[PDB]
Design a protein around this ligand. Structure first.
Ligand SMILES: COc1ccc(C(SC[C@H](N)C(=O)O)(c2ccccc2)c2ccccc2)cc1
Ligand SMILES: Nc1ncnc2c1ncn2[C@@H]1O[C@H](COP(=O)(O)OP(=O)(O)O)[C@@H](O)[C@H]1O
Ligand SMILES: [Mg+2]
Ligand code: NA
Length: 331
């Protein structure tokens, strides 16, 4: 009923990456939705969208997210994940960065990414939509098949959580004791994101290469109530999972491995999908051949230094376009 959407975002050259050649190793054509990689031999790939090195945060938000936010408001469950090599900009894409000197408010920070922009817009849209709504958020991270809660205000970050099958959703799990924070208005957004980032820093001191090996799952749930013309009360639940995956180059890698095998199983129509075999694929079962509208943002480098991982990423992402989901609205 609906293919997983796959898009590619190339970042600029970083301070490490040498460009020797007059014509780009990696060419992005947003109009033709093509990425072309000089391995004079060039492999070309078509995707649903393509964003070259110059693409700004606001452009990614407008092109990818705005349409997905509308699906969320219709009561679809939606998932956007960032996939790619460490250093290519998964976190830059999904979260962004904070500009220094407080030269900008968080709402106008041009380095801000999907999560802060999305949260701001939810309030803008639903307030002048007139509708009765509440928003709650959670931030869960997975490292070494263990579950870290970054929004719990009270506990040590080293107090890890447990997962169990949802009696109310054949393809879902409940994270027991996961902190779910009600965001009453947009002026409560920043302090939440701040607490999440700070607590992550604490996690990074406890675990080897935490940034690059961890998966980050930021969940926003919107309860919306509507009156029908026949005078009945309609409750819709829209859900957005914004997922920043472990670096593609990587028990430490069980979740990333199993995601691989799950994707392979779905595209090759093999009959057993091993969702159950890692924490990430249990949490995202529904995003991967289930009842969710899913997008992948594949992040890549333009540089010869990182060409092999860039090629693996493109091939991995490109195959995922064949995954068929069956989107359904929550009333
Ligand atoms: C989990 O989601 C987050 C958390 C933190 C931020 C974020 S950027 C976080 C950055 N990616 C990081 O890894 O620490 C922020 C930074 C510093 C303090 C508070 C927030 C930010 C929010 C709005 C605008 C610009 C930057 C953005 C998203
Ligand atoms: N689209 C981009 N434009 C400019 N700088 C970027 C972009 N994407 C990533 N960067 C920079 O590249 C570095 C790595 O980004 P990061 O988000 O940590 O990547 P990842 O999470 O994939 O490892 C950071 O300095 C970041 O600010
Ligand atoms: Mg990252
Ligand atoms: Na343990």
């Amino acid at each position: 009923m609906k293919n997983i959407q796959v898009v590619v975002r190339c970042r600029p050259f970083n301070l490490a990456e040498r460009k020797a050649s007059a014509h780009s190793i990696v060419e992005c054509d947003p109009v033709r939705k093509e990425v072309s990689v000089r391995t004079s031999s060039r492999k070309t790939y078509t995707f649903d969208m393509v964003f070259g090195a110059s693409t700004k945060q606001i452009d990614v938000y407008r092109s990818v997210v705005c349409p997905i936010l509308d699906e969320v408001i219709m009561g679809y469950n939606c998932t956007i994940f960032a996939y790619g090599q460490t250093g290519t900009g998964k976190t830059f894409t999904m979260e962004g960065e904070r500009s220094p000197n407080e030269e900008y408010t968080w709402e106008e920070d041009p380095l801000a990414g999907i999560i802060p922009r999305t949260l701001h817009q939810i309030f803008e849209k639903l307030t002048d939509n007139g509708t009765e709504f509440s928003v709650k958020v959670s931030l869960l991270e997975i490292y070494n098949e263990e579950l870290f809660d970054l929004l719990n205000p009270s506990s040590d970050v080293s107090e890890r959580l447990q997962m169990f099958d949802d009696p109310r959703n054949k393809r879902g799990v409940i994270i027991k004791g996961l902190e779910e924070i009600t965001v009453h208005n947009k002026d409560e957004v920043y302090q939440i994101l701040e607490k999440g980032a700070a607590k992550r820093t604490t996690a990074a001191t406890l675990m080897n290469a935490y940034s690059s090996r961890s998966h980050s799952v930021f969940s926003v749930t919107i309860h919306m109530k509507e009156t029908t013309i026949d005078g009945e009360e309609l409750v819709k639940i829209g859900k957005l999972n914004l997922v920043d995956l472990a670096g593609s180059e990587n028990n430490i890698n069980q979740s990333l491995l199993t995601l691989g095998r799950v994707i392979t199983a779905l595209v090759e129509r093999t009959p057993h999908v091993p969702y159950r075999e890692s924490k990430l694929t249990r949490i995202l079962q529904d995003s991967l051949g289930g009842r969710t509208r899913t997008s992948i943002i594949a992040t890549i480098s333009p540089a010869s230094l990182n060409l092999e991982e860039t090629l693996s990423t493109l091939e991995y992402a490109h195959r995922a376009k064949n995954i068929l989901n069956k989107p359904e609205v929550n009333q």
